[PDB]
Amino acid sequence: ANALVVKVSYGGVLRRFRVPVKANGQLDLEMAGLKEKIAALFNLSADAELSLTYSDEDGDVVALVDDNDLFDVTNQRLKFLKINVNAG
Amino acid sequence: ANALVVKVSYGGVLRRFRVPVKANGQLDLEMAGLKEKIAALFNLSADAELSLTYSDEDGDVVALVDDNDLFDVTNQRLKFLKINVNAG
């Protein structure tokens, strides 16, 4: 009955919020619902371009592009996800 | 007159349901009755390919392909069966 901890950080300020999962198994938001969620935390202009990059299990710097790779984060089995913002 | 606990897990969310046996000794469903049963739990597109892999007694990742290997799960004498989905 549990959520995934997501920690983001832009301009050297770490934040954290939680994302519920369905009974089904997929994460209960999408990129369109995520990009506007990050713009809430940082008082960012939402029209700006967002370059979101997580960390893999085995430490690469992967890119986030679609709701298909948001599916992969569940199967990746990571303890908490960490997402870097690059704007402008 | 008793059932086998099967636990499935796709997108990192565990589920569980039970499967009865006959008086005779075989499991009381088959793959076509199983594959469409898993698609009920996960709201999966049933037209997608399913690659179902159980765990052996001695811990291998065996493949499930047919109703001949579903027979073997009874004789395998496992405490509860665990079935991983790989789609796409």
Numbering used by the authors:
A (entry chain B), B (entry chain A): 5 to 92
Pull verbatim passages from the article behind this deposition.
PB1 domains are protein interaction modules with critical roles in the assembly of protein complexes involved in autophagy, signaling, cell division, and redox processes, as well as the auxin-response pathway in plants. While type A and type B PB1 domains can form heterodimeric protein complexes, type AB members can mediate interactions with either PB1 domain type or engage in homotypic interactions to form homo-oligomers or hetero-oligomers. Our cryo-EM structures of filamentous p62 and AtNBR1–PB1 assemblies revealed that the presence of a tandem arginine sequence in the basic motif of type AB interfaces is required to stabilize a polymeric assembly.
Of the three PB1 assemblies studied, AtNBR11–94 (AtNBR1–PB1) and p621–122 (p62-PB1) formed homogeneous filaments of constant diameter that appeared best suited for high-resolution structure investigation by cryo-EM. Further analysis revealed that the occurrence of L-type or S-type assemblies is persistent along the individual helices in micrographs of AtNBR1–PB1, whereas for p62-PB1 filaments regularly displayed transitions from L-type to S-type symmetry. Using the derived symmetries, we determined the 3.5/3.9- (L-type, p62/AtNBR1) and 4.0/4.4 Å- (S-type, p62/AtNBR1) resolution structures. All four structures form tubules of ~120 Å and 150-Å width with an inner diameter of 45 Å and 70 Å for AtNBR1–PB1 and p62-PB1, respectively. The relative orientation between adjacent subunits is very similar in the respective S-type and L-type assemblies of AtNBR1–PB1 and p62-PB1. The main interactions are formed between a double arginine finger formed by two neighboring arginine residues in strand β2 (R19–R20AtNBR1/R21–22p62) stabilizing strong salt bridges to acidic residues (D60/D62/D64/D73AtNBR1 or D69/D71/D73/E82p62) in the OPCA motif located in the β2–β3 loop and the α2 helix. These interactions are assisted by the canonical-type B lysine (K11AtNBR1 and K7p62) in strand β1. In addition to the canonical transverse interactions, the helices are further stabilized by longitudinal interactions Y14AtNBR1/N28AtNBR1 or K102p62/D92p62 and R59p62/D93p62 to subunits of neighboring strands along the helical axis.
